[PDB]
Amino acid sequence: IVGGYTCGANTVPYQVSLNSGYHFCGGSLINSQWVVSAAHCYKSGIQVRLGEDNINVVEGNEQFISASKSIVHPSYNSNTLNNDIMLIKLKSAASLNSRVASISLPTSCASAGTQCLISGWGNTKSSGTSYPDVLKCLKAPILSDSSCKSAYPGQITSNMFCAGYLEGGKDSCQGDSGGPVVCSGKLQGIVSWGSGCAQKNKPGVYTKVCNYVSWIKQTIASN
Numbered sequence: 267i268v269g270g271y272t273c274g275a276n277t278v279p280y281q282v283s284l285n286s287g288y289h290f291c292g293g294s295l296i297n298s299q300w301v302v303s304a305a306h307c308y309k310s311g312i313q314v315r316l317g318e319d320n321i322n323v324v325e326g327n328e329q330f331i332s333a334s335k336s337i338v339h340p341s342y343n344s345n346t347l348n349n350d351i352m353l354i355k356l357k358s359a360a361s362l363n364s365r366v367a368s369i370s371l372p373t374s375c376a377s378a379g380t381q382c383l384i385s386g387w388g389n390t391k392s393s394g395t396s397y398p399d400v401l402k403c404l405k406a407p408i409l410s411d412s413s414c415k416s417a418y419p420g421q422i423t424s425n426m427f428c429a430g431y432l433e434g435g436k437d438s439c440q441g442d443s444g445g446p447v448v449c450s451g452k453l454q455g456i457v458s459w460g461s462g463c464a465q466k467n468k469p470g471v472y473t474k475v476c477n478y479v480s481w482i483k484q485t486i487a488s489n
């Protein structure tokens with residue numbers, strides 16, 4: 267997250283870190299046994315880390331649970347990033363309370379102008395590299411589809427939305443991928459892609475979760 271603020275320990279209780287010997291992607295806890303992330307985050311050998319603030323220090327609220335199964339969206343296209351969404355099932359159910367909690371799926375899509383919270387442990391610089399140890403937060407509005415398509419001609423599908431600032435300076439970044447965009451207490455987006463980070467006229471592009479609710483529910487119910 268570029269241009270954000272330190273969230274505070276366990277203020278974002280549905281945030282997860284995906285770990286394969288090091289943090290590589292974020293994700294969101296949607297119930298006690300399932301996580302949603304970006305398909306471009308796919309790896310074998312994932313451990314899901316819940317209850318994290320500082321990802322380099324054991325602080326006392328963490329739950330570390332291995333993945334038993336990963337399911338990439340059946341129509342994921344790695345060249346266009348269309349359908350950049352994946353589900354991860356945990357080997358055992360997480361223990362839920364105020365500091366580890368699930369986030370609700372949306373019943374409708376959010377409109378341009380809605381303010382949302384984006385969070386993660388990704389790069390905090392638009393030029394160069396600096397990865398934080400503690401979780402960073404950013405408040406950002408959803409942009410209109412027209413703005414979003416004008417910023418990225420020929421690249422925005424119906425499964426994507428833009429959020430952020432056309433002026434630049436504030437954005438998600440590498441390492442935030444897979445993490446949550448929450449608006450009005452519902453999961454509306456997954457950190458997916460962008461051209462660089464926090465560049466003028468190049469806002470973040472997010473997977474539009476409201477288009478996937480039936481797939482997520484059906485998948486959860488049978489696996």
Ligand SMILES: [Ca+2]
Pocket residue numbers: 318319320321322323324325328
């Ligand atoms: Ca920790």
